[PDB]
Design a protein around this ligand. Structure first.
Ligand code: HEM
Ligand code: HEM
Ligand code: HEM
Ligand SMILES: [Fe+2]
Ligand SMILES: [Fe+2]
Ligand SMILES: [Fe+2]
Ligand SMILES: [Fe+2]
Ligand SMILES: [Fe+2]
Ligand SMILES: [Fe+2]
Lengths: 159, 157, 158, 158, 157, 157
């Protein structure tokens, strides 16, 4: 029982998205943490653990197909300065992952595995359920205005 | 005992208001749910369930009068895009109900049954307790301003 | 992402089945309770709310596809007088559900969305459990006889 | 210490009755479950596991006599469609077991083992305790009539 | 609504795998029960009930398709003497199941049922989650050695 | 108050060791997880999370110095096949971190900050409490021999 290496690569190209998404959420989480924009920092910190949960079940599956996880390669990572830029860039990153997950399942359905597609749809169902929130968030600032939007995301701590 | 048919349609035209008001509340409750306006979405879900409670006690009464509920015919339903139009539209819907309910009871009390008028006033007492609320709500946006009014209706959760 | 309207209308014609099924279940639930037929009216009221919430998970899907729910148009609704007629009627109503749902998902799997079809099977799996039950119930009346079948559906509770 | 192969086979001929009886009870338990005949399906599922508890202690016993359990051969299994003949069919299956077990224990007492026939009587006290019950059941249908007898075993589900 | 017989037989040949695997797991569990290798027999008894859980949901499906379960005929069942042979033979039995499951779901997906394939994948997901553990165990012995592998399976209790 | 840039890369070259260390632990932890080498797999998962506790306060330090964390580039990561190779490889990785931590604090004390060096010693106390343990582990195999050493790592559960 050996996985077809393209299907393995179809798993593997998903994996490079995982490691980059860990750091770009977490540093931005640590970015706003100094910036005091408090409740949104609580969101992306709790969000980042789900991709840790997303990546681990990915990691087991290729071992069931007797694969070799490359944790060495990486994609390019970006940073922003205001949150709109932070909300615009990762959208493309979330726009990046879907089509790869889209194009993977149609071909892997043609090649007789069922179980790895069940992994692939499940993570794909998360991100479409994820990206809309950002799409909800951005204009909700943008129609309203950033300053009053900034005026509600902060609070003084409990010393 | 047989229900008088004139009273029966007076119950019935109220029922047509009920089913239409269910959907126009609920979809607009689901509309702001996507639009992140969290707290009023909790409120509009709470308003919809009372009309669901309003309709069932309406429903059994005509069966006591041995009637046939038309759950088939409806009235025209509208939608809005900002909240103010939604607050303007349902006002007319609330303006639609009361005067017709005002029309029914006097004619009903003229014809010797008491019991459905008790249902009439009880359902009237809610909407007169309801129509003023949005009437207070809309000017409170309008005097103040919509953008800051939007600045308190959301929640990141 | 914008939903393809052929998927959207196929979501939409499911919705028209949903609203009509609410009223025909509930009124017939409000039929037999006056008729004393108690536990099936408990069952029919219990049958309503699952079919209710089936439409809500239908509803929230199409706004992700940026759609406009027609909560205005309906299908034709029927009533009966004895329960056998009701059990014959809703069978056809459930007979209308599956094949159209069967007609959809093949095309939906043919057109590069997966996520909506998971709802499509999920609403299907319920009515698989539903249509046989009423199919079971009718022969129980028919092999036995209606009168003794009425002789177990009523209690002294009012 | 080695078991005498006749006694082993006489233990073994019980075992063929065991696995056959498990399926013929369980499918009928699943049959009336689809047929809605509720409490008998509760009773048939409950009666089946005692036979599962029956067969396992037989399986250890031949290992104590250092035997080889044939889990391969099976006797012929039947099925019906009405409820009555199922009570007639298993009666013969109940009639099949006892006399052969009656044939054994005399020979078991004839040949200097005590312990295996203790299992034989322990299972035989069960098989008498079944055959009377179904015999009590069937005439109670038969004197009364099937339809009113059927008119008490179905009840609604949750 | 009637089940298609080619779908039905595909359920049916799966069923023959069930009853054979029940006895071969259970007796070999009862084999090491004499042989004092208790913790794997604890593993074997708990594993055997899950196939009994797999078999009943197989059974109720076909009567929804209005089918007739053949609980009558079976396939050939084997026995071993050391555990490696027991680990080698059931692997083939697990190798027997999955391709037949692979052969079924491709065809019935072309033939307009969805629901029984959901049953088929669910048991198929178990066996691929099963057969690796067999494959994990057997190489772990022969790399290490059998006698020390025997040196960890008794309990004296 | 601005961080002196020489301090910043000396924080940063520690950081490049950090992200590489998590994966080489975890994948090898996931390697033995398939291999049934479970009790040390429990240990290696515990080793991963402490490094996350080490790396975060490192990241919190540099923003006080107004720094830019390069989470982008890495160092070279290796894999092994038997545990001795794994215990030999990470030893060098443990040997890699200390001298950089050693060469830091002499300069960190030399240039009028204490607080970053307080982090620098606090991380350094961990690996000296760590590299001895793995050094103890490998020789404990080495006198003994791998097979009997492996013969206690299996749980069968
Ligand atoms: C101060 C707290 C934490 C920090 C700074 C942190 C940070 C990180 C980072 C940077 C990664 C990516 C490294 C990698 O993927 O190998 C990661 C992965 C992970 N962490 Fe955390 N984490 C924290 C809390 C936790 C806790 C408390 C747990 C478990 C009880 C946990 C479980 C995991 C898991 C399962 C992964 C995925 C492993 C992997 O994909 O390689 N994390 N964490
Ligand atoms: C003709 C009468 C009614 C109609 C048309 C109606 C309609 C609905 C609808 C559309 C939903 C959304 C479910 C979904 O999206 O899946 C719902 C939910 C619900 N229904 Fe009704 N309803 C009616 C009467 C009632 C009444 C009077 C009650 C209870 C006293 C009730 C019990 C419920 C409850 C409790 C929920 C909320 C379930 C939840 O929050 O999880 N229904 N109903
Ligand atoms: C929730 C509890 C149980 C379930 C779902 C279950 C399931 C089943 C079913 C349905 C069968 C019949 C299949 C057939 O023979 O065609 C079976 C066979 C069997 N049952 Fe169970 N059973 C349960 C309890 C038990 C227990 C607790 C034991 C033993 C301690 C047991 C012992 C057996 C044996 C040994 C067989 C195989 C018969 C043979 O090899 O001849 N059962 N199992
Ligand atoms: Fe993901
Ligand atoms: Fe009302
Ligand atoms: Fe439904
Ligand atoms: Fe027995
Ligand atoms: Fe299975
Ligand atoms: Fe560290």
């Amino acid at each position: 029982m050996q996985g077809d290496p393209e299907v393995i690569e179809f798993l593997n190209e998903q994996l490079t998205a995982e490691l980059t998404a860990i750091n770009q959420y977490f540093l931005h989480a640590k970015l706003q943490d100094h910036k005091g924009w408090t409740k949104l920092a609580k969101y992306t910190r709790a969000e980042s653990f789900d991709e840790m949960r997303h990546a681990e079940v990915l990691t087991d599956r290729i071992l069931l197909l007797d694969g070799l996880p490359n944790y060495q390669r990486l994609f390019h990572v970006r940073v922003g300065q205001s949150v709109t830029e932070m909300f615009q860039a990762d959208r493309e990153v979330e726009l990046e992952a879907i089509d790869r997950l889209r194009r993977g399942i149609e071909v892997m359905r043609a090649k007789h595995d069922i179980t790895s597609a069940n992994v692939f749809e499940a993570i794909l169902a998360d991100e479409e359920h994820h990206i809309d929130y950002l799409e909800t968030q951005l204009d909700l600032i943008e129609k309203l205005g950033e300053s009053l939007y900034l005026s509600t995301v902060i609070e003084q701590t409990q010393p």
